[PDB]
Amino acid sequence: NYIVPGEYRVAEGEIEINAGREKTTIRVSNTGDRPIQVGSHIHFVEVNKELLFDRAEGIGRRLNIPSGTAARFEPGEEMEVELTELGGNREVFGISDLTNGSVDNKELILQRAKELGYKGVE
């Protein structure tokens, strides 16, 4: 019966994020010499050119991490990350200008990524 003003009494259980969406695990390497931190909702194929991964596996996806959190890659660090699928209309505009439309246009996204030197177009 000690009173903490404004305290929460949360219910039992756990919150599943991104429920019902396909999950994909990929290896990602920071080939650069400065740290790279990647937010939960950036279209994964459009991250920093010096991150090396299978760029095709980032298309239409983002990190499967809590909204507003980020994954950190120290210089030279390689690690596995889990991706989830983008929702809504599955369209991306701006960011690195690799998509500007449907994420379904994989050949066009990868052609742009390869021309501009985004590592890992295979």
Binding site: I3, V4, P5, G6, E7, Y8, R9, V10, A11, E12, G13, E14, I15, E16, I17, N18, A19, Q37, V38, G39, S40, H41, I42, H43, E46, R62, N64, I65, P66, S67, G68, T69, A70, E82, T84, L86, G87, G88, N89, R90, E91, V92, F93, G94, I95
Partner: protein
């Protein structure tokens, strides 16, 4: 990926089934539903969701379903529900309650809640958000009263007065066309919504009606101007023609009639009964019986709320000092004893809990505290839980039923009573964006941020010279919504239909938003949200005991309240 519920609530605020304590009370509110999509919650900052191409849309112009403001992750407490949502504001109004963000990449985005280039963000995660309080018993005595009201989450002041004149010190009255015009001009500088009451006194229609045509939003009948059968009748004839509300402070002295005579003069017409318990004024000792009737919209004023061990000693002396009464003049003592009654004050706590008194109000600077309407509402609800138990209607161990009954008393019900609920009084789509953010630890005590017409007007914020805004001293301060010409767009002057049709705003050069008073004359007790009970209230003329359904309504006064010495420096 799963997040446990403690970590989820700390990051995004609470979700379905989670409970939150209201300040240091024994009251718990439970999240009833949540509009989010888990994993796509909106949030703002470094590496966060509301960034261009991500949770912020980079394509759409402002007109294309984009918001001016998104409040993220709000716990709404309203007569409509206790639930988790994002709140979208545009053109100063609430346009969307749901889920904000970017339909490009997020599931479940409410279609008119796009975060775009034009959108400002307020983080409401971990905050309780309510409608601004609607105070319908304001004496305009001291302009310093406006910040007092804003600091406790009040956004609309209805009442009257010209400053510290004796008529204004006693009565919520701005009398006559000239005083009304002068106070409408004064209002251009007050950073709060305002409606002005004229004098509800006269035996001819024209002297009363000319106040409504001059820009009054309603009338006040007060015994200090003669609360006679004639004044009551003429005021209600005017109100029925003009579609404005009448408030009454009845004939305490029973000089021209008893309560039944006042009810006969009203003749079934809609009326707002102020301080219905009667310590603040009215037919001695039985005025509170008004609250049983279907044509009465009944409010309390705040100093009797709730019944405490210092209440009677405080009120008897206050009444003697304010009426220049002498402790050695037996008529003066008899009058005070007939007006300040523990029997009716204790029953008033219970009538609030039963939904028989529908509204709270201040009586600011006449017999009430400008900054304690919200405070004392929750202290009453807490006292009733502690003395009467959870209401029968509760489930899950939450106090949601009581919380909706009590929040209604200072938000939606005053707005309905005054004819202004099309504009203010609740968190609903299409209403003006008057919103109060509360930290739960300060809920009902000190507002965090007060939003007026979609811009912050008042905030608890720190040192203006500091690197960041949180260093001491943290105090209530007027924000940019109050500055320059923005005070015009963030606040509403409520006026009669006739004054608006006759061009009073243009005549006086009023630049504020003009709100229309309407749909005041058609309503009754049945229209008071969560507080719609009609019943025969019996007040024993010998003992002052109050009975409803054959049962005496009594409770004990308390020695201590929450929302008191933990919080206040004085």
């Amino acid at each position: 990926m799963k997040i446990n519920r403690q970590q989820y609530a700390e990051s995004y605020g609470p979700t379905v089934g989670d409970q939150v304590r209201l300040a240091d009370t024994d009251l718990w509110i439970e999240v009833e539903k949540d509009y989010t999509t888990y994993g796509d919650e909106a949030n703002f900052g470094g590496g966060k969701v509301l960034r261009e191409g991500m949770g912020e849309n980079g394509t759409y112009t402002r007109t294309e379903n984009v918001l001016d403001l998104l409040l993220t992750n709000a716990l709404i407490l309203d007569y409509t529900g206790i639930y988790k949502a994002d709140i979208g504001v545009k053109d100063g109004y609430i346009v969307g309650i749901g889920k904000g963000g970017n339909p490009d990449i997020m599931d479940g985005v409410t279609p008119n809640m796009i975060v775009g280039t034009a959108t400002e963000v307020i983080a409401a995660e971990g905050k309780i958000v309510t409608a601004g309080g609607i105070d319908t018993h304001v004496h305009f005595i001291n302009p310093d009263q406006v910040d007092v009201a804003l600091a406790n989450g009040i956004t609309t002041l209805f009442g009257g007065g010209t400053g510290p004149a004796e008529g204004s010190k006693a009565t919520t009255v701005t009398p006559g066309p000239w005083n009304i015009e002068k106070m409408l001009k004064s209002t251009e500088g007050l950073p709060i919504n305002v409606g002005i009451l004229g004098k509800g006194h006269g035996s001819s229609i024209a002297p009363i009606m000319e106040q409504i045509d001059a820009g009054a939003a309603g009338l006040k009948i007060h015994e200090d101007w003669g609360a006679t059968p004639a004044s009551i009748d003429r005021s209600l004839t005017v109100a029925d023609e003009a579609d404005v509300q009448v408030a009454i402070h009845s004939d305490t002295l029973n000089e021209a009639g008893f309560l039944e005579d006042t009810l006969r003069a009203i003749n079934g017409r809609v009326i707002h009964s102020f301080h219905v318990e009667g310590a603040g004024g009215g037919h001695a000792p039985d005025i509170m019986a008004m609250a049983g009737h279907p044509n009465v919209l009944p409010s309390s004023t705040n100093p009797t709320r709730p019944f405490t061990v210092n209440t009677i000693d405080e009120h008897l002396d206050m009444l003697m000092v304010c009426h220049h009464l002498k402790q050695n003049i037996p008529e003066d003592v008899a009058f005070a004893d007939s007006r300040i009654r523990p029997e009716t004050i204790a029953a008033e706590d219970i009538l609030h809990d039963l939904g028989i008194i529908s509204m709270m109000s201040t009586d600011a600077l006449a017999m009430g505290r400008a900054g304690e309407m919200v405070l004392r509402t929750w202290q009453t609800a807490d006292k009733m839980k502690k003395q009467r138990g959870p209401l029968a209607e509760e489930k899950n161990g939450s106090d949601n039923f009581r919380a909706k009954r009590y929040v209604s008393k200072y938000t939606i019900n005053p707005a309905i009573a005054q004819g202004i609920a099309h504009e203010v009084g609740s968190i609903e789509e299409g209403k003006f964006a008057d919103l109060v953010l509360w930290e739960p630890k300060f809920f009902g005590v000190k507002a965090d941020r007060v939003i007026k017409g979609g811009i912050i007007a008042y905030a608890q914020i720190g040192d203006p010279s500091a690197s960041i805004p949180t260093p001491q001293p943290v105090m209530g301060r007027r924000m940019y919504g109050t500055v320059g010409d923005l005070i015009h767009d963030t606040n509403i002057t409520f006026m009669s239909k006739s004054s608006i049709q006759q061009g009073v705003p243009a005549k006086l050069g009023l630049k504020r938003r003009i709100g229309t008073v309407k749909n005041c004359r058609n309503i009754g007790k049945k229209d008071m949200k969560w507080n719609d009970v009609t019943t025969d209230i019996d007040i024993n003329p010998e003992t002052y005991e109050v009975k409803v359904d054959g049962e005496v309504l009594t409770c004990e006064p308390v020695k201590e309240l929450p929302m008191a010495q933990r919080y206040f420096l004085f």
